[model samples]
Target chain A: ETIASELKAIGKELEDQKKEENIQIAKIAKEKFDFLSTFKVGPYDLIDEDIQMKIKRTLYSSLDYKKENIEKLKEILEILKKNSEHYNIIGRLIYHISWGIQFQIEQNLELIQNGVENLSQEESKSLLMQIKSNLEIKQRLKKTLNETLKVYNQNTQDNEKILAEHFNKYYKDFDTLKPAF
Target chain B: ETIASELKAIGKELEDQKKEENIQIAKIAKEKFDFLSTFKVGPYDLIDEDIQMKIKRTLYSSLDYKKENIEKLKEILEILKKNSEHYNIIGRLIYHISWGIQFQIEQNLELIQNGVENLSQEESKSLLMQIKSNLEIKQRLKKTLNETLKVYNQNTQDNEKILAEHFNKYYKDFDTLKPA
Candidate 1:
């Protein structure tokens, strides 16, 4: 019944859903690839060699474009699959909720203290100890997450550069293809 | 450069910004943890056993809460990293731009045809062939993106539900923690 366990359960459900969606995407990709493969350029034996070569290059470029699309889709599927197991969204929700609960407790501290006067010294000590321990756990978790986040951020930066460079190269190559006529 | 590539470059810039923000968050988290760890509850040898045990439990629960926060932050970082390489935003922009380009071309088709009559048969054939191949590429890309979008939408729905359920559970558990 703990909040952590409950949050984990929700994370699991999200992961399972992502897996299902991954399968569906895989299926769609296969079907589309099959359909695209059916397209073929007709033979141009009657055309001059220079023009024929241009046409051939165009066809090849088109094929490459199609392949790139398929590859990109596959990448998207992979990302979805990987993200499914992640609890980032749930974690955010829990953090906010926890803060809310803490705020509520703080607001009612005076009322709670008035009641606490009736409790034994031992009981008061126990409550304080519990609060301290919970805070410690929260701090430790934050430390670990911070380290991981640092690594993730670095990786993201690298990824962004590579992706941008890739597109730049593609754009340059695409521009080189002028009309043969 | 094509609109697609231009948009992708912008996407890359946005992703880089996110990464920079992520680093800042991580640094903040580390500083906070260091400060929190310095706090210690003194040895309460003066307290009785039952009260001591209750205090220990509360402390443990608090520790657990901190750990959960760190884990969650890590997950968010992971998501940012993964999405950095994704072309979803760029693809969407490109799709819209491509349609615009297509519309422009269609509108100019009449003018193009007027010029086309001046060309030789071989030239006309070559031009048509190139156009057809480009169209094929566009169509194929569209098909792939559509399918991917469908999958993304499904995943997003699942994520939303899981996130909602988690909050509900937390709310329920929190309600039970009365002033003990």
Candidate 2:
């Protein structure tokens, strides 16, 4: 739940930032198209406020997946607490997750995040993001994350079977097939 | 090219071993199922040759994708080489290819292969080859080998790019960002 809460906190922060970014981007769009006089509304719905909402919604959708995945991961860890094997795996996972976040993810995430660093447009803009690759990256990362989690789940089932069979054979061999008997 | 050649070598070696295994399995089948009598081939088809090679061909097809992937991979490697960025990746890849054949392919191609360990059957003047899980083990080894090569390729490309960029930057900086 620590992760989940952290994710939500991040999402809320990013959402606020996105709102501000929307205003900046909107201003740029108006200037880019010279929409003020061209569209001729008192506001021109700048009234493509609906389109503005859509943009923010798309941006927020990108962050929402991380928040939900964090919740799922926390729940998985909680379930893992009930048994030794699962607990051990979860323990290792938590250790790795903590290490990854602390050592790698946090730094990279900060670098890409808007306004996290004092960055000029040319210096700080993501390599692919300028070409709308941020949208693609978000989708790909989400899919890869889900796929990785699914592999873990599938591996859980496989490992259980392997362990169970090994346990049976091991115990039966040592206990029942002992020469002393 | 190296990976492909190595895999092809491995595939050929496996093909030979698989042939022997087919014989062994058929011998086992004949003894267990009275296969010769059932098919009316008696001792010779049971002993001398196969009535069907279909299963053996199908089993060998397991290496098909791996063999095909090598050509596809070579295209990438050659392009990288053309740009002078492929050497590191190609070098690593060939090393991986050699390791795979040296380690896993040897077992499948050499041991119990060309001809397998001689085995004898029960209650009859019967001779057969020893059965080994050579195919299964070879498949697993090949899987690992391919995966290792793939990841190595990625690393090679990344390392090459990093080094190339560093060197380029160094040269640019040496020229004093102006007329030398």
Candidate 3:
């Protein structure tokens, strides 16, 4: 089977494993501790939907992380690591594992480049165009964020003034007006 | 007449001169030039009404400042000068002259202490009582002003912060959730 199909099948199997793990944890909470079934793990409240599900299943499951599963997980991790490196420009908002995956045969360049020895000019141009569009999107996001930071820096200093100069026009008249002789 | 009646006559003459000077200055705005009267003299705005009127008339007019008038003005000035020195606590607001004379022939203390011998104990007590009441009013006014100035000292700083601290909690969770 292809790498794409294998990853999809593995992803589906992970979903099943996540439900099983959650049920087991819930049963322990109810039976041994007499805790309510509605109880939620507070720290896990911030987890990203699918990425944390995979991380949790891997960390706390009966399934073995050996052979084929380990190989696929490593490849998936490599893609995520590269994406983290690519997006190092802006302030990070998403969980690192959540943001790691970006390419999913969307541009088709990776598959084509690996398989074909000789490419037509149209194929090469399409590959370059896709790369340019992705770079442009990242550049625009950076510019928008940079401009917002500039205005924020400006408004920060505007609110700290306490004293200002006071003017009195009557000072001149007071100086001139003296006791009548 | 007594010393009080002479002081009263001088005060009336000063008031007449003040009105005459105002009319003269007021005419300077109308008859000679086509100037607008919208212009207000800023120095006159802060001047104690009667004191400025007296000072302005004496400065700008042919109004007589006779020897009697001059001596009374000097005595009035001596009292006001001490009042100004006594109020060295906060910024000055009420003009001493803005308050006109309070005691004239009430006790005749100014005449008695200078011209006659002391006799009645009741008269001395009443003199001290009037002096004490005036002093208490000034002390209370000073105390009130000081408390208000303290509030102004407290209310001196008002500032706004940029929207950044609100994002710090989100950043903490984000950094901790990383695999590293």
Point to the candidate with the largest TM-score: 1
Interface RMSD of each: 10.7, 21.0, 18.1
Q: Compose the digit string of candidate 1's lDDT tens values, residues B1-180.
A: 233333334335534643654464445446564222222123232434433322222222222325444343233223333453434433322323333334433433432435555656665555455545544444443443334334434544554444344334432443322232
Q: Which has the higher DockQ value, candidate number 1 or candidate number 3?
A: 3
Q: How far does residue B135 in candidate 3 sit from its true spot (Å)?
A: 24
Candidate 3: regions farther than 4 A off = A1-109, A116-121, A162-181, B1-180
Candidate order by TM-score, decreasing, is 1, 3, 2
Clashes of 3: 0
User: Tens digit of lDDT per residue, candidate 2, span B103-172?
Assistant: 4434434433443223222311111111123344334434543443464455444533433333233222
- Angstrom error of the Cα, residue A39, model 3: value is 23
After superposing candidate 1 on the true structure, give the runs of residues whose Cα lies further than 4 Å from its correct spot. Answer: A1-112, A115-117, A141-162, A175-181, B1-108, B111-126, B129-133, B136-180
Better of 1 and 3 by lDDT: 1
Which one wins by DockQ: 1 or 2?
1
